[PDB]
From a paper:
In order to improve the resolution of this structure, we collected a dataset of the same complex, in the presence of the non-hydrolizable ATP analogue App-NHp, using a state-of-the-art Titan Krios instrument. Using this better and larger dataset, we were able to refine the structure to ~3.9 Å resolution. Intriguingly, while MlaE was predicted to have 6 TM helices, we observe that TM1 does not traverse the membrane, but is monotropically embedded in the inner leaflet, a feature similar to the G5G8 human sterol exporter, suggesting similar mechanisms between these complexes, and further supporting the MLA system as a lipid exporter. MlaF is bound to MlaB away from the nucleotide binding site, similar to the recently reported E. coli MlaBF structure, with the C-termini of MlaF binding the opposing MlaB subunit by a handshake mode. We also observed that this pocket is coated by cationic residues, mainly Arg14, Arg47 and Arg234 of MlaE, forming a charged pocket that might attract a lipid head group. As the sample was solubilized in DDM, this density is most likely occupied by the maltoside ring, with the flexible hydrophobic chains extending up into an apolar region of MlaE. Accordingly, we observed clear density of the nucleotide and magnesium, within the MlaF binding pocket. The resolution was sufficient to map the phosphate binding regions like Walker-A motif around Lys55 of MlaF, as well as binding of the γ-phosphate by Ser51 and His211 (H-loop).
Here, we report the cryo-EM maps of the core MLA complex, MlaBDEF, from the pathogen A. baumannii, in the apo-, ATP- and ADP-bound states, revealing multiple lipid binding sites in the cytosolic and periplasmic side of the complex.
Author numbering:
A (entry chain C): 8 to 94
B (entry chain L), C (entry chain K): 11 to 263
D (entry chain A), E (entry chain B): 3 to 256
Amino acid sequence: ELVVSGKIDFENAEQQYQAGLAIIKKQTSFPLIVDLKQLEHGNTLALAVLVQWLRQTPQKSGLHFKNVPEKMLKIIQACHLQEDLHL
Amino acid sequence: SLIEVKNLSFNRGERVIYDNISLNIRRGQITAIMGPSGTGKTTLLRLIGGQLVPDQGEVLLDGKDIAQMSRQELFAARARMGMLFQSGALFTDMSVYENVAFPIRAHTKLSENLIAELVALKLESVGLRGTEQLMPTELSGGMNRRVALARAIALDPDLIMYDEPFAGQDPIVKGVLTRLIRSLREALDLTTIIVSHDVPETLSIADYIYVVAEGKIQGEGTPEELQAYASPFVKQFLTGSAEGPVEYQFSHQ
Amino acid sequence: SLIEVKNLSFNRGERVIYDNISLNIRRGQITAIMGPSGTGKTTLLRLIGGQLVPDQGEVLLDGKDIAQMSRQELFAARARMGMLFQSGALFTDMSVYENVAFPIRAHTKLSENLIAELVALKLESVGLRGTEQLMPTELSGGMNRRVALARAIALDPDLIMYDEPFAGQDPIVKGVLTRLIRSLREALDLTTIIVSHDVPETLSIADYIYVVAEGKIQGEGTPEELQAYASPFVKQFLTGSAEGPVEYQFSHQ
Amino acid sequence: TIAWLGRLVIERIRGIGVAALMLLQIIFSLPSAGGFGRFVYQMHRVGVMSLLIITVSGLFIGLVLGLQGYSILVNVGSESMLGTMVSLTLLRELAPVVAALLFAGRAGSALTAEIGSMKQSEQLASMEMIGVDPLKQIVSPRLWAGIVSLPMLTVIFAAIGIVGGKLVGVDFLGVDEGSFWSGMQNNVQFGHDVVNGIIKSIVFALLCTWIAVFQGYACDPTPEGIATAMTRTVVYSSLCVLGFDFVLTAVMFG
Amino acid sequence: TIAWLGRLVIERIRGIGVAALMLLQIIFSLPSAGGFGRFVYQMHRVGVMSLLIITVSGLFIGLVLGLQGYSILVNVGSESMLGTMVSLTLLRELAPVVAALLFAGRAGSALTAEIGSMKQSEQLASMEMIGVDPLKQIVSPRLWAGIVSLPMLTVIFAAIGIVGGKLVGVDFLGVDEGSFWSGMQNNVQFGHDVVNGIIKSIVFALLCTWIAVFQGYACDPTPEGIATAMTRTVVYSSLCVLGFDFVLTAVMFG
Ligand SMILES: Nc1ncnc2c1ncn2[C@@H]1O[C@H](COP(=O)(O)OP(=O)(O)NP(=O)(O)O)[C@@H](O)[C@H]1O
Ligand SMILES: Nc1ncnc2c1ncn2[C@@H]1O[C@H](COP(=O)(O)OP(=O)(O)NP(=O)(O)O)[C@@H](O)[C@H]1O
């Protein structure tokens, strides 16, 4: 529903990070699904941001594998970060 | 991006190491360099646009001459490279966590939370998750190389250089390094350079190979093509035959 | 010479390197030892050579227990073997003449004129006739190593040991050393031991191979038999395959 | 034949010019760009770790001066001189020299080896490839930690030496204590002689550390180079200290 | 945590036991006289190559003693005292210590580095299989060159120091040659002001070289260890010289 869209670069990582945290503060269960295909590709730190966001509510299975960009899922699989995140 | 080096000439210690080298590093491809030891392999990589200054010729990144053009761009441009130098360097005074984290601080200004997460992701990409608090000096040799590589790919660089990664090792490790290269060239859309003496491994990895000796390129091609052009030097070099343009010192009397 | 090694055990300080190794070094044959890096390959040669004290082990030279030999028997026995060490072990303070000549003075009392002729013959047999009177420090890599070998064969020993001869990186050198081993093996009726790394080069030379890891023999056989009975450790080891009994740290939350 | 020496002299002097250039590049107070936590840490290796050696040396020197002074003074019959001479000897000539030589010396050698190792290992090359100028990370805090540490150690050395001097000169050998302390005041002063001892140690600290950094860092990567550099630092550090000690003492007390 | 120190101390002391055993074997049995004809070569790198440093330092020390002696002695008896103090100081305390430490530096680290490499390269080890005992072939002539060389250097250091003292004390600063020379003869006895300088020199020569050989011939074949060995030979022989100097001078002139 609430999607932190656009390019996550190193330079603005801090603000994109806080925007997501604000979305989390307004927490739902099931956690809101984020379309990550609205993000610009080629940024591993985008994942670092996404991982930290999910980990703010680690007890919640807020997984949206369908909305993961192909480049993002390829780095996840290559790096053994693959988990059953299907929905 | 594409990297071009043209008419390179370099003299160190009053000797010429390189004489009019002309290279085309193809984007997204694996480019490899082979040759006799002690002939400039590390030097040539350093002259790609590192810290060495050529006497003649040009270095082009994206077609632009890196010499002079400009300070700020070059500082930022440097964030696009990662390397393993010879045995591979780790800083002894830093934990593994810090060795991987280190280059991040050269170009970014991040919260402790995000720098920590990037280190965790990069260590898992090479099978090192969970070794963050150990000092690097306590690692086995197979792990020292993997830690250094995690540093090299820490900034999402476009070019990874492996300086003689296959030179001397354990067959198990050779299997692992080969796999990491295959995994990463795809996962990160990388352009890579492998410079190595161990011809049998290079021949099955690279898309394109240059054979360099005595300061000159002595033949180029895909591995299939190099085998087709048996200049005595290249042919002996790529086969291991003891016969060819090599010397022994004798004369009977 | 047949060398028996039985129930070998050896610790370096508190660490066990070997645990009941049983070897048969076959007369007139080339035997070889392969295994993972750092598992004591050199330690084993040093024990075979009698330079280390085995812990309750038995070592027999032509059936004779080395532990029971008198000073004269031991001294004379030294003239039965020569070894080429991993670094080449040349003496920097002496010219090539003395480096090859040197061991002759440990066992003989010869006129300077005959000493000089033996040096000339031994250097010729390895292509070093023209290096006479040069200091060894001025030699190129391949030449440097050949001199060291010339010393090892200076006394016409029965047994030659080569410690990591195929770890050289230069394909040209690999060509030459392979030929010298075969050439000398035949010319002098030698029994030899090759202890190395990079499998594409010991599997085509040895007549018989032991695979050693973690203080144990992991299998033995001719190159063909090792593949036939390649217990998974051996199989992946000789193949250089990934997914063998190789671990890395891993857990996630 | 002869030209061999000539080539050696020419290359060593060229090297000095390089060292001078390096000192100029490092000395500008640029390191403020990063944190100084690194400095505090570095001081651990150049200063704190060497206190044991300098302390033991100071005690033996003090006791030796005590016994030699005494066996001469008993032929003058004037024992008040133990105070005056133990103090002047240590403050003017020995603390600034013994401390400088034991310091570099040990710290000198170890520092040379450590920087040189970082060159040989390719660690420094990597830093430039990353983009962090090594002079601001590896060299800077090492040069300054050496500057602060030696002068401070010089003071401790003298302090131990004076105490060691009294311990034998007055307490075992029967000298009336009041003349010892009076002899020190008569006529060596805190505002003059102590000050000159410190000035000489600032000069020595710079010569010793500057050389140690240079010898480690500025060298093409020859494998035998580290051991040679370590020996060379000890020799040059030592002659520079003695050559300068002469010209400075010749002015301060001339 | 704490037991760490415990283990460090225990092992370092075990090592001294080993050193004692090594010394016994090298000195105790040396029958191979035919090969000892080469120690004269070995001496080249201990004695011949070290005169430049000992000579230059001897001159600076002599000149410094001259200037400091003079500025104190103008209030007590320079006409008689420059002679007596310059010669007793150099014969009793400084030639045996300054030369001993400069030597420990220049010859000591170089020698330990050399044995170290002989071991690290495995070159030394290859001799065992040739039947040539490395202690009789490699170590013997090095230890002996050290014993002879330091004492001869010690004398030269003092000889230069006398030239230095006179050069400033008598020739630039206005003192009589007559009383300088006679004063020295009146107070310096061969027995035992010259002789004790030599005795202390022999003790230091043996102790200092013994350590350099021992540490170079290290147990652990790791490259990091060469630099460590070099630093340690300087530190240990340095403290040992000062410790033994104290006891010997205490006896000789007490
Ligand atoms: N900075 C330097 N200045 C002067 N000489 C150097 C320097 N660095 C190394 N040497 C020499 O310059 C060359 C260093 O690079 P290089 O030839 O590329 O090594 P390499 O081929 O990778 N060595 P190797 O891995 O053993 O085959 C060699 O010829 C060295 O003898
Ligand atoms: N006295 C000693 N004390 C402690 N370690 C020692 C000593 N002497 C030698 N070393 C040991 O010597 C061993 C030699 O065997 P190893 O480590 O397997 O090297 P290697 O055989 O050349 N390795 P590789 O080339 O892969 O076959 C090392 O593990 C060192 O610890």
